[PDB]
Design a protein around this ligand. Structure first.
Ligand code: 2GP
Ligand code: CA
Length: 104
């Protein structure tokens, strides 16, 4: 069973922890990767009711199982905060334009 289902992409907790650790490390060091500069702030324009506090950051999580290192980020993201607490796993899949919906 999937811990998080983003459209048809299936993630375990392990996938999420791995992606989040990479994104948080870059965040801590002040470095980014890719043309969209990940990780970057996530403004929560959608207004998700995250259980942890802002500020929030987003980092791509890939269905290949690899950690994001540039190139296309796909549709899915992990959102973490300043304390490296996971806020949620979100996706552009099934959402209009560049909006997001929560992975289930
Ligand atoms: N939909 C949405 N996009 C956000 C938010 N915060 C940042 N973004 C970024 O704002 C622009 C509009 O979607 C894009 O740069 C998107 O980038 P990402 O694709 O990297 O998430 C947010 O809270 N909601
Ligand atoms: Ca996996």
């Amino acid at each position: 069973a999937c811990d998080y289902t983003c459209g048809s992409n299936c993630y375990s907790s392990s996938d999420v922890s791995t992606a989040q650790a990479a994104g948080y490390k870059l965040h801590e060091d002040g470095e980014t990767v890719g043309s969209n500069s990940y990780p970057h702030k996530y403004n929560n324009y959608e207004g998700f009711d995250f259980s942890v506090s802002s500020p929030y950051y987003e980092w791509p999580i890939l269905s290949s199982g690899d950690v994001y290192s540039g190139g296309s980020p796909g549709a899915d993201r992990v959102v973490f905060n300043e304390n490296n607490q996971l806020a949620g796993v979100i996706t552009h899949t099934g959402a209009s334009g560049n909006n997001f919906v929560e992975c289930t």
